[PDB]
């Protein structure tokens, strides 16, 4: 599913991401834009053989099991395929663990490079929430 901007913002708000660990809703929308272009089915393969999955591009090296990343962990305790659903619940719940692990949203390279320090509120401008 390819979310609209405000559609995703509303869905993320209902799942508790607005100001989660101090990150306002705009940050999460911005990160999703540049990680996946709002597409829940996005996948991308890293040089080390791990794969990133879903709207927030969660990495199989640490966070989910895809059965092909040897020596990896599964800290969100989910199959990576679960992160590709049209229902973003699994992605959001795993994202909450990631962002709480000490590095905040710096774990998302596109957030660090394209959102951090910008007017992220612009990303929820006009949306009904």
PDB file of N, CA, C and O in Angstrom, residues 64-102:
ATOM      1  N   UNK A  64      14.475  -8.159  12.558  1.00  0.00           N
ATOM      2  CA  UNK A  64      13.478  -9.117  12.139  1.00  0.00           C
ATOM      3  C   UNK A  64      14.184 -10.307  11.508  1.00  0.00           C
ATOM      4  O   UNK A  64      15.383 -10.226  11.226  1.00  0.00           O
ATOM      5  N   UNK A  65      13.456 -11.410  11.322  1.00  0.00           N
ATOM      6  CA  UNK A  65      13.997 -12.613  10.707  1.00  0.00           C
ATOM      7  C   UNK A  65      13.476 -12.781   9.295  1.00  0.00           C
ATOM      8  O   UNK A  65      12.262 -12.772   9.078  1.00  0.00           O
ATOM      9  N   UNK A  66      14.391 -12.895   8.334  1.00  0.00           N
ATOM     10  CA  UNK A  66      14.021 -13.176   6.938  1.00  0.00           C
ATOM     11  C   UNK A  66      14.645 -14.468   6.460  1.00  0.00           C
ATOM     12  O   UNK A  66      14.619 -14.763   5.273  1.00  0.00           O
ATOM     13  N   UNK A  67      15.216 -15.228   7.390  1.00  0.00           N
ATOM     14  CA  UNK A  67      15.780 -16.521   7.067  1.00  0.00           C
ATOM     15  C   UNK A  67      16.968 -16.524   6.120  1.00  0.00           C
ATOM     16  O   UNK A  67      17.386 -17.587   5.659  1.00  0.00           O
ATOM     17  N   UNK A  68      17.542 -15.360   5.824  1.00  0.00           N
ATOM     18  CA  UNK A  68      18.693 -15.350   4.926  1.00  0.00           C
ATOM     19  C   UNK A  68      19.775 -14.364   5.333  1.00  0.00           C
ATOM     20  O   UNK A  68      20.623 -14.000   4.516  1.00  0.00           O
ATOM     21  N   UNK A  69      19.759 -13.945   6.592  1.00  0.00           N
ATOM     22  CA  UNK A  69      20.779 -13.037   7.087  1.00  0.00           C
ATOM     23  C   UNK A  69      21.557 -13.729   8.196  1.00  0.00           C
ATOM     24  O   UNK A  69      21.267 -13.538   9.372  1.00  0.00           O
ATOM     25  N   UNK A  70      22.538 -14.556   7.823  1.00  0.00           N
ATOM     26  CA  UNK A  70      23.170 -15.388   8.853  1.00  0.00           C
ATOM     27  C   UNK A  70      23.896 -14.594   9.941  1.00  0.00           C
ATOM     28  O   UNK A  70      24.559 -13.592   9.667  1.00  0.00           O
ATOM     29  N   UNK A  71      23.725 -15.029  11.187  1.00  0.00           N
ATOM     30  CA  UNK A  71      24.379 -14.390  12.307  1.00  0.00           C
ATOM     31  C   UNK A  71      23.663 -13.143  12.767  1.00  0.00           C
ATOM     32  O   UNK A  71      24.187 -12.379  13.570  1.00  0.00           O
ATOM     33  N   UNK A  72      22.453 -12.944  12.272  1.00  0.00           N
ATOM     34  CA  UNK A  72      21.682 -11.762  12.599  1.00  0.00           C
ATOM     35  C   UNK A  72      20.805 -11.993  13.816  1.00  0.00           C
ATOM     36  O   UNK A  72      20.632 -13.121  14.266  1.00  0.00           O
ATOM     37  N   UNK A  73      20.227 -10.909  14.319  1.00  0.00           N
ATOM     38  CA  UNK A  73      19.335 -10.975  15.458  1.00  0.00           C
ATOM     39  C   UNK A  73      17.920 -10.684  14.990  1.00  0.00           C
ATOM     40  O   UNK A  73      17.690 -10.300  13.837  1.00  0.00           O
ATOM     41  N   UNK A  74      16.971 -10.861  15.895  1.00  0.00           N
ATOM     42  CA  UNK A  74      15.558 -10.675  15.587  1.00  0.00           C
ATOM     43  C   UNK A  74      14.917  -9.976  16.792  1.00  0.00           C
ATOM     44  O   UNK A  74      14.081 -10.552  17.507  1.00  0.00           O
ATOM     45  N   UNK A  75      15.332  -8.733  17.033  1.00  0.00           N
ATOM     46  CA  UNK A  75      14.982  -8.064  18.282  1.00  0.00           C
ATOM     47  C   UNK A  75      13.510  -7.659  18.361  1.00  0.00           C
ATOM     48  O   UNK A  75      12.978  -7.494  19.455  1.00  0.00           O
ATOM     49  N   UNK A  76      12.823  -7.533  17.228  1.00  0.00           N
ATOM     50  CA  UNK A  76      11.394  -7.217  17.300  1.00  0.00           C
ATOM     51  C   UNK A  76      10.541  -8.465  17.288  1.00  0.00           C
ATOM     52  O   UNK A  76       9.322  -8.393  17.428  1.00  0.00           O
ATOM     53  N   UNK A  77      11.202  -9.607  17.120  1.00  0.00           N
ATOM     54  CA  UNK A  77      10.571 -10.917  17.217  1.00  0.00           C
ATOM     55  C   UNK A  77       9.455 -11.071  16.202  1.00  0.00           C
ATOM     56  O   UNK A  77       8.329 -11.460  16.532  1.00  0.00           O
ATOM     57  N   UNK A  78       9.784 -10.781  14.949  1.00  0.00           N
ATOM     58  CA  UNK A  78       8.796 -10.860  13.888  1.00  0.00           C
ATOM     59  C   UNK A  78       9.448 -11.361  12.613  1.00  0.00           C
ATOM     60  O   UNK A  78      10.639 -11.160  12.406  1.00  0.00           O
ATOM     61  N   UNK A  79       8.666 -12.013  11.752  1.00  0.00           N
ATOM     62  CA  UNK A  79       9.164 -12.224  10.394  1.00  0.00           C
ATOM     63  C   UNK A  79       9.248 -10.877   9.686  1.00  0.00           C
ATOM     64  O   UNK A  79       8.365 -10.043   9.876  1.00  0.00           O
ATOM     65  N   UNK A  80      10.297 -10.649   8.908  1.00  0.00           N
ATOM     66  CA  UNK A  80      10.423  -9.386   8.178  1.00  0.00           C
ATOM     67  C   UNK A  80       9.238  -9.121   7.247  1.00  0.00           C
ATOM     68  O   UNK A  80       8.883  -7.972   6.998  1.00  0.00           O
ATOM     69  N   UNK A  81       8.629 -10.191   6.730  1.00  0.00           N
ATOM     70  CA  UNK A  81       7.487 -10.069   5.840  1.00  0.00           C
ATOM     71  C   UNK A  81       6.338  -9.345   6.504  1.00  0.00           C
ATOM     72  O   UNK A  81       5.519  -8.728   5.820  1.00  0.00           O
ATOM     73  N   UNK A  82       6.258  -9.443   7.827  1.00  0.00           N
ATOM     74  CA  UNK A  82       5.206  -8.761   8.592  1.00  0.00           C
ATOM     75  C   UNK A  82       5.307  -7.244   8.477  1.00  0.00           C
ATOM     76  O   UNK A  82       4.347  -6.528   8.739  1.00  0.00           O
ATOM     77  N   UNK A  83       6.478  -6.758   8.086  1.00  0.00           N
ATOM     78  CA  UNK A  83       6.733  -5.318   7.964  1.00  0.00           C
ATOM     79  C   UNK A  83       6.333  -4.780   6.612  1.00  0.00           C
ATOM     80  O   UNK A  83       6.578  -3.614   6.308  1.00  0.00           O
ATOM     81  N   UNK A  84       5.731  -5.627   5.794  1.00  0.00           N
ATOM     82  CA  UNK A  84       5.383  -5.224   4.445  1.00  0.00           C
ATOM     83  C   UNK A  84       3.872  -5.103   4.325  1.00  0.00           C
ATOM     84  O   UNK A  84       3.355  -4.765   3.263  1.00  0.00           O
ATOM     85  N   UNK A  85       3.165  -5.379   5.414  1.00  0.00           N
ATOM     86  CA  UNK A  85       1.694  -5.359   5.403  1.00  0.00           C
ATOM     87  C   UNK A  85       1.151  -3.951   5.145  1.00  0.00           C
ATOM     88  O   UNK A  85       1.831  -2.955   5.402  1.00  0.00           O
ATOM     89  N   UNK A  86      -0.084  -3.869   4.673  1.00  0.00           N
ATOM     90  CA  UNK A  86      -0.756  -2.584   4.527  1.00  0.00           C
ATOM     91  C   UNK A  86      -1.072  -1.968   5.893  1.00  0.00           C
ATOM     92  O   UNK A  86      -1.276  -0.759   6.008  1.00  0.00           O
ATOM     93  N   UNK A  87      -1.118  -2.811   6.917  1.00  0.00           N
ATOM     94  CA  UNK A  87      -1.354  -2.379   8.294  1.00  0.00           C
ATOM     95  C   UNK A  87      -0.006  -2.140   8.947  1.00  0.00           C
ATOM     96  O   UNK A  87       0.797  -3.071   9.089  1.00  0.00           O
ATOM     97  N   UNK A  88       0.265  -0.902   9.346  1.00  0.00           N
ATOM     98  CA  UNK A  88       1.630  -0.541   9.754  1.00  0.00           C
ATOM     99  C   UNK A  88       1.893  -0.872  11.213  1.00  0.00           C
ATOM    100  O   UNK A  88       2.914  -0.488  11.752  1.00  0.00           O
ATOM    101  N   UNK A  89       0.981  -1.593  11.851  1.00  0.00           N
ATOM    102  CA  UNK A  89       1.123  -1.851  13.284  1.00  0.00           C
ATOM    103  C   UNK A  89       2.484  -2.483  13.634  1.00  0.00           C
ATOM    104  O   UNK A  89       3.173  -2.024  14.533  1.00  0.00           O
ATOM    105  N   UNK A  90       2.869  -3.535  12.924  1.00  0.00           N
ATOM    106  CA  UNK A  90       4.119  -4.215  13.215  1.00  0.00           C
ATOM    107  C   UNK A  90       5.317  -3.292  13.009  1.00  0.00           C
ATOM    108  O   UNK A  90       6.278  -3.320  13.783  1.00  0.00           O
ATOM    109  N   UNK A  91       5.271  -2.478  11.967  1.00  0.00           N
ATOM    110  CA  UNK A  91       6.380  -1.562  11.723  1.00  0.00           C
ATOM    111  C   UNK A  91       6.506  -0.538  12.818  1.00  0.00           C
ATOM    112  O   UNK A  91       7.602  -0.222  13.224  1.00  0.00           O
ATOM    113  N   UNK A  92       5.382   0.018  13.252  1.00  0.00           N
ATOM    114  CA  UNK A  92       5.386   1.053  14.265  1.00  0.00           C
ATOM    115  C   UNK A  92       5.884   0.491  15.594  1.00  0.00           C
ATOM    116  O   UNK A  92       6.632   1.146  16.311  1.00  0.00           O
ATOM    117  N   UNK A  93       5.483  -0.723  15.929  1.00  0.00           N
ATOM    118  CA  UNK A  93       5.856  -1.283  17.217  1.00  0.00           C
ATOM    119  C   UNK A  93       7.339  -1.630  17.260  1.00  0.00           C
ATOM    120  O   UNK A  93       8.002  -1.477  18.297  1.00  0.00           O
ATOM    121  N   UNK A  94       7.876  -2.054  16.129  1.00  0.00           N
ATOM    122  CA  UNK A  94       9.296  -2.333  16.056  1.00  0.00           C
ATOM    123  C   UNK A  94      10.068  -1.000  16.040  1.00  0.00           C
ATOM    124  O   UNK A  94      11.071  -0.845  16.736  1.00  0.00           O
ATOM    125  N   UNK A  95       9.593  -0.029  15.268  1.00  0.00           N
ATOM    126  CA  UNK A  95      10.196   1.297  15.288  1.00  0.00           C
ATOM    127  C   UNK A  95      10.275   1.872  16.707  1.00  0.00           C
ATOM    128  O   UNK A  95      11.239   2.534  17.036  1.00  0.00           O
ATOM    129  N   UNK A  96       9.280   1.630  17.566  1.00  0.00           N
ATOM    130  CA  UNK A  96       9.348   2.126  18.924  1.00  0.00           C
ATOM    131  C   UNK A  96      10.519   1.502  19.694  1.00  0.00           C
ATOM    132  O   UNK A  96      11.169   2.170  20.492  1.00  0.00           O
ATOM    133  N   UNK A  97      10.837   0.240  19.431  1.00  0.00           N
ATOM    134  CA  UNK A  97      11.970  -0.362  20.123  1.00  0.00           C
ATOM    135  C   UNK A  97      13.278   0.220  19.599  1.00  0.00           C
ATOM    136  O   UNK A  97      14.203   0.498  20.366  1.00  0.00           O
ATOM    137  N   UNK A  98      13.362   0.390  18.287  1.00  0.00           N
ATOM    138  CA  UNK A  98      14.569   0.928  17.674  1.00  0.00           C
ATOM    139  C   UNK A  98      14.910   2.295  18.263  1.00  0.00           C
ATOM    140  O   UNK A  98      16.011   2.517  18.738  1.00  0.00           O
ATOM    141  N   UNK A  99      13.938   3.205  18.245  1.00  0.00           N
ATOM    142  CA  UNK A  99      14.151   4.579  18.639  1.00  0.00           C
ATOM    143  C   UNK A  99      14.461   4.697  20.132  1.00  0.00           C
ATOM    144  O   UNK A  99      15.033   5.702  20.561  1.00  0.00           O
ATOM    145  N   UNK A 100      14.117   3.663  20.904  1.00  0.00           N
ATOM    146  CA  UNK A 100      14.368   3.626  22.340  1.00  0.00           C
ATOM    147  C   UNK A 100      15.690   2.975  22.697  1.00  0.00           C
ATOM    148  O   UNK A 100      16.012   2.857  23.871  1.00  0.00           O
ATOM    149  N   UNK A 101      16.447   2.536  21.699  1.00  0.00           N
ATOM    150  CA  UNK A 101      17.634   1.737  21.970  1.00  0.00           C
ATOM    151  C   UNK A 101      18.872   2.605  22.251  1.00  0.00           C
ATOM    152  O   UNK A 101      19.967   2.080  22.468  1.00  0.00           O
ATOM    153  N   UNK A 102      18.694   3.923  22.286  1.00  0.00           N
ATOM    154  CA  UNK A 102      19.767   4.821  22.694  1.00  0.00           C
ATOM    155  C   UNK A 102      20.236   5.812  21.642  1.00  0.00           C
ATOM    156  O   UNK A 102      20.856   6.824  21.993  1.00  0.00           O
TER     157      UNK A 102
END
